[PDB]
Design an enzyme around this catalytic site. Sequence first.
Site, PDB file in Angstrom:
ATOM      1  N   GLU A 241      77.024 -68.694  97.747  1.00 60.04           N
ATOM      2  CA  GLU A 241      76.902 -68.123  99.112  1.00 60.04           C
ATOM      3  C   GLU A 241      77.589 -66.769  99.155  1.00 60.04           C
ATOM      4  OE1 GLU A 241      79.040 -70.976 101.701  1.00 60.04           O
ATOM      5  OE2 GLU A 241      79.928 -69.264 102.688  1.00 60.04           O
TER       6      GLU A 241
ATOM      7  N   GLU B 286      74.381 -76.397 112.413  1.00 61.64           N
ATOM      8  CA  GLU B 286      75.727 -76.602 111.851  1.00 61.64           C
ATOM      9  C   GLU B 286      76.758 -76.417 112.949  1.00 61.64           C
ATOM     10  OE1 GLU B 286      78.455 -74.764 108.245  1.00 61.64           O
ATOM     11  OE2 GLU B 286      76.350 -74.170 108.397  1.00 61.64           O
TER      12      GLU B 286
ATOM     13  N   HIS C 101      77.325 -68.313 112.363  1.00 58.91           N
ATOM     14  CA  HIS C 101      76.533 -67.689 111.290  1.00 58.91           C
ATOM     15  C   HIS C 101      75.067 -68.099 111.310  1.00 58.91           C
ATOM     16  CE1 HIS C 101      78.087 -71.270 108.901  1.00 58.91           C
ATOM     17  NE2 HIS C 101      76.871 -71.242 108.361  1.00 58.91           N
TER      18      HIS C 101
ATOM     19  N   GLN D  22      75.024 -65.703 106.384  1.00 60.63           N
ATOM     20  CA  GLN D  22      75.420 -66.536 105.228  1.00 60.63           C
ATOM     21  C   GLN D  22      74.210 -66.577 104.316  1.00 60.63           C
ATOM     22  OE1 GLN D  22      75.955 -71.044 105.534  1.00 60.63           O
ATOM     23  NE2 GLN D  22      78.106 -70.279 105.399  1.00 60.63           N
TER      24      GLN D  22
ATOM     25  N   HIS E  88      69.327 -72.325 108.456  1.00 59.12           N
ATOM     26  CA  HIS E  88      70.076 -73.002 109.529  1.00 59.12           C
ATOM     27  C   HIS E  88      70.764 -71.989 110.456  1.00 59.12           C
ATOM     28  CE1 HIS E  88      73.329 -72.790 106.387  1.00 59.12           C
ATOM     29  NE2 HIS E  88      74.145 -72.730 107.396  1.00 59.12           N
TER      30      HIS E  88
HETATM   31  C1  LIG Z   1      78.652 -74.435 103.039  1.00 55.60           C
HETATM   32  C2  LIG Z   1      77.859 -73.935 104.242  1.00 55.60           C
HETATM   33  C3  LIG Z   1      78.678 -73.371 105.305  1.00 55.60           C
HETATM   34  O1  LIG Z   1      78.320 -72.948 106.407  1.00 55.60           O
HETATM   35  O2  LIG Z   1      79.920 -73.607 105.179  1.00 55.60           O
HETATM   36  C4  LIG Z   1      76.561 -74.238 104.312  1.00 55.60           C
HETATM   37  O3  LIG Z   1      75.936 -73.918 105.294  1.00 55.60           O
HETATM   38  S1  LIG Z   1      75.812 -75.182 103.067  1.00 55.60           S
HETATM   39  C5  LIG Z   1      74.050 -75.326 103.569  1.00 55.60           C
HETATM   40  C6  LIG Z   1      73.257 -76.356 102.800  1.00 55.60           C
HETATM   41  N1  LIG Z   1      73.602 -77.703 103.260  1.00 55.60           N
HETATM   42  C7  LIG Z   1      72.834 -78.399 104.078  1.00 55.60           C
HETATM   43  O4  LIG Z   1      71.798 -77.939 104.512  1.00 55.60           O
HETATM   44  C8  LIG Z   1      73.278 -79.833 104.353  1.00 55.60           C
HETATM   45  C9  LIG Z   1      72.488 -80.428 105.506  1.00 55.60           C
HETATM   46  N2  LIG Z   1      71.091 -80.643 105.202  1.00 55.60           N
HETATM   47  C10 LIG Z   1      70.664 -81.841 104.834  1.00 55.60           C
HETATM   48  O5  LIG Z   1      71.455 -82.782 104.738  1.00 55.60           O
HETATM   49  C11 LIG Z   1      69.236 -82.048 104.528  1.00 55.60           C
HETATM   50  O6  LIG Z   1      68.689 -80.820 104.081  1.00 55.60           O
HETATM   51  C12 LIG Z   1      68.258 -82.393 105.608  1.00 55.60           C
HETATM   52  C13 LIG Z   1      68.512 -82.056 107.028  1.00 55.60           C
HETATM   53  C14 LIG Z   1      68.734 -83.872 105.789  1.00 55.60           C
HETATM   54  C15 LIG Z   1      66.879 -82.829 105.223  1.00 55.60           C
HETATM   55  O7  LIG Z   1      66.817 -83.642 104.052  1.00 55.60           O
HETATM   56  P1  LIG Z   1      66.168 -83.043 102.691  1.00 55.60           P
HETATM   57  O8  LIG Z   1      66.894 -81.777 102.170  1.00 55.60           O
HETATM   58  O9  LIG Z   1      66.258 -84.245 101.771  1.00 55.60           O
HETATM   59  O10 LIG Z   1      64.612 -82.625 102.931  1.00 55.60           O
HETATM   60  P2  LIG Z   1      63.796 -83.629 103.815  1.00 55.60           P
HETATM   61  O11 LIG Z   1      62.596 -83.773 102.975  1.00 55.60           O
HETATM   62  O12 LIG Z   1      64.796 -84.787 104.097  1.00 55.60           O
HETATM   63  O13 LIG Z   1      63.199 -83.135 105.200  1.00 55.60           O
HETATM   64  C16 LIG Z   1      63.170 -84.082 106.256  1.00 55.60           C
HETATM   65  C17 LIG Z   1      62.429 -83.347 107.308  1.00 55.60           C
HETATM   66  O14 LIG Z   1      63.293 -82.308 107.793  1.00 55.60           O
HETATM   67  C18 LIG Z   1      62.723 -81.028 107.639  1.00 55.60           C
HETATM   68  N3  LIG Z   1      63.772 -80.025 107.275  1.00 55.60           N
HETATM   69  C19 LIG Z   1      64.495 -80.026 106.137  1.00 55.60           C
HETATM   70  N4  LIG Z   1      65.362 -79.009 106.054  1.00 55.60           N
HETATM   71  C20 LIG Z   1      65.138 -78.302 107.207  1.00 55.60           C
HETATM   72  C21 LIG Z   1      65.722 -77.086 107.740  1.00 55.60           C
HETATM   73  N5  LIG Z   1      66.641 -76.436 107.007  1.00 55.60           N
HETATM   74  N6  LIG Z   1      65.284 -76.688 108.941  1.00 55.60           N
HETATM   75  C22 LIG Z   1      64.307 -77.388 109.589  1.00 55.60           C
HETATM   76  N7  LIG Z   1      63.716 -78.493 109.187  1.00 55.60           N
HETATM   77  C23 LIG Z   1      64.080 -78.976 108.002  1.00 55.60           C
HETATM   78  C24 LIG Z   1      61.687 -81.197 106.531  1.00 55.60           C
HETATM   79  O15 LIG Z   1      60.659 -80.261 106.805  1.00 55.60           O
HETATM   80  C25 LIG Z   1      61.236 -82.615 106.759  1.00 55.60           C
HETATM   81  O16 LIG Z   1      60.371 -82.512 107.868  1.00 55.60           O
HETATM   82  P3  LIG Z   1      58.895 -83.256 107.896  1.00 55.60           P
HETATM   83  O17 LIG Z   1      59.073 -84.709 108.233  1.00 55.60           O
HETATM   84  O18 LIG Z   1      58.373 -83.127 106.490  1.00 55.60           O
HETATM   85  O19 LIG Z   1      58.086 -82.578 109.022  1.00 55.60           O
HETATM   86 CO   LIG Z   2      76.199 -72.655 106.953  1.00 58.63          CO
END
Ligand SMILES: C/C(C(=O)O)=C(/O)SCCNC(=O)CCNC(=O)[C@H](O)C(C)(C)COP(=O)(O)OP(=O)(O)OC[C@H]1O[C@@H](n2cnc3c(N)ncnc32)[C@H](O)[C@@H]1OP(=O)(O)O
Ligand SMILES: [Co+2]
Lengths: 139, 139
Positions: free
Chosen positions: B43, B134, B7, B60, B84
């Site tokens: 979602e 992912e 996705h 998604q 993502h």
């Molecule tokens: C349920 C489902 C499914 O498929 O089943 C889903 O998909 S749920 C989808 C939602 N769930 C998720 O996204 C969970 C995984 N994501 C996370 O754990 C977090 O978002 C992450 C990766 C750690 C980043 O942490 P946070 O949200 O606290 O923001 P952050 O301030 O830590 O950002 C750290 C650095 O990473 C960058 N950054 C943050 N999100 C980003 C993204 N989506 N794509 C690219 N870069 C990204 C951000 O610009 C910062 O870069 P600079 O240093 O400033 O350059």
């Molecule tokens: Co997803």
Amino acid sequence: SLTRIDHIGIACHDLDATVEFYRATYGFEVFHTEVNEEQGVREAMLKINDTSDGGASYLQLLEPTREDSAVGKWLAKNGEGVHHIAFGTADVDADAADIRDKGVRVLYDEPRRGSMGSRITFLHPKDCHGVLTELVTSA
Amino acid sequence: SLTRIDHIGIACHDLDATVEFYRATYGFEVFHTEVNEEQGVREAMLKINDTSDGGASYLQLLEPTREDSAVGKWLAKNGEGVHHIAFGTADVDADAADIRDKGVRVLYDEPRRGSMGSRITFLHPKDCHGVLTELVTSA
Ligand SMILES: C/C(C(=O)O)=C(/O)SCCNC(=O)CCNC(=O)[C@H](O)C(C)(C)COP(=O)(O)OP(=O)(O)OC[C@H]1O[C@@H](n2cnc3c(N)ncnc32)[C@H](O)[C@@H]1OP(=O)(O)O
Ligand SMILES: [Co+2]
Ligand SMILES: C/C(C(=O)O)=C(/O)SCCNC(=O)CCNC(=O)[C@H](O)C(C)(C)COP(=O)(O)OP(=O)(O)OC[C@H]1O[C@@H](n2cnc3c(N)ncnc32)[C@H](O)[C@@H]1OP(=O)(O)O
Ligand SMILES: [Cl-]
Ligand SMILES: [Cl-]
Ligand SMILES: [Co+2]
């Protein structure tokens, strides 16, 4: 009708380094590479799977050939990351005409050349909730 | 092994408005909707095609349930757009362990619940040339 995800366009500073990251980390191989002077990109296609409509899905890794290009400007502003998504269709001209008739901006009157001789157009990202959206008919 | 694009995760301010844009513009229908309280998202999955590994590819669409969430923070900083990409695999635990062993940061020790009972993990975008990545095993 749009019958597949054709590709994910991913902008990068260094194509050879990013291709190596995909190969080493996931085992994805290079399907094709080419330069598109009109679009201002050096591209690598990595095939991830085949699709139920007879086509395929790819990662399209893109490095800009010049700063004054779609991808060069985007990289300067946003850094490396997803640049666009592309949907496959058997008839990009007809699907483009239908979408034009809904008031979504179609960037090209006539489809232009994309990867592997494909015919492509784009929808303005401000008309697509922030996603630059490509339409593709394979050759 | 990663055998498909599962996705494209697309962040939006208003799920119902964005779902309607995809339906009206392209004819894509809602496959599934759910709320993931742990992830902080409402979602909608739109199925675009089936894939050669027996799985499928989806858009998604994600609206944040709270500002202090992955998608809420990302929307605040970047606006609506691709958030993502997700790759499908028959064994997310093994593929995650292999990728951990390459020094790419795997965000979860143990896969967590994702869409339609799937098991998911994420790779840090700074380890993936700017793409939040992912990994998904379908239920
Ligand atoms: C349920 C489902 C499914 O498929 O089943 C889903 O998909 S749920 C989808 C939602 N769930 C998720 O996204 C969970 C995984 N994501 C996370 O754990 C977090 O978002 C992450 C990766 C750690 C980043 O942490 P946070 O949200 O606290 O923001 P952050 O301030 O830590 O950002 C750290 C650095 O990473 C960058 N950054 C943050 N999100 C980003 C993204 N989506 N794509 C690219 N870069 C990204 C951000 O610009 C910062 O870069 P600079 O240093 O400033 O350059
Ligand atoms: Co997803
Ligand atoms: C060959 C191939 C293949 O598949 O075959 C390829 O895919 S070649 C791929 C490369 N080729 C292309 O991308 C061609 C289509 N793209 C374009 O024509 C242009 O990049 C577009 C869409 C018009 C934008 O114009 P430009 O590059 O001059 O930058 P811009 O300053 O006009 O930006 C106008 C607004 O659109 C936003 N914007 C720009 N690029 C964006 C993108 N990739 N995704 C989401 N939003 C984007 C930007 O933040 C501005 O928003 P704010 O108002 O500031 O909020
Ligand atoms: Cl050329
Ligand atoms: Cl829940
Ligand atoms: Co493209």
